[PDB]
C-alpha cells in the first residue's frame with residue numbers, strides 16, 4: 001500500500017488583545033489551522 | 040502572467056487582492 005505522509009498540523013499562536021488599560025479579554029488566532037485540530 | 044512544513048509558514052497579506060482591486 002502507498003501512503004502519503006502529511007506533516008502534523010502546526011502553526012503560530014497569536015493573541016489579539018486590546019490594551020490591559022481596556023480589558024483582560026483576549027482572542028487567540030491559531031495560524032493556518034483548521035478549527036478541528038485546535039483542542 | 041505572474042506565476043514548506045519545516046517550521047516554514049506563509050502569512051496571508053492583510054489586504055486581499057479584492058481590497059487592492061477596490062483601492
Ligand SMILES: *[C@@H]1O[C@H](CO)[C@@H](O)[C@H](O)[C@H]1NC(C)=O
Pocket residue numbers: 021
Ligand atoms: C491605564 O491604566 C493606568 C493605571 O495605572 C491609568 O493610570 C491610566 O490613566 C490608564 N490609561 C488610559 C489611557 O486609560
Ligand SMILES: *[C@@H]1O[C@H](CO)[C@@H](O)[C@H](O)[C@H]1NC(C)=O
Pocket residue numbers: 034035036
Ligand atoms: C476543515 O475540515 C473540514 C472537515 O474536517 C473541511 O470540510 C473543511 O473544508 C476544512 N477547512 C479548512 C479551512 O481547512
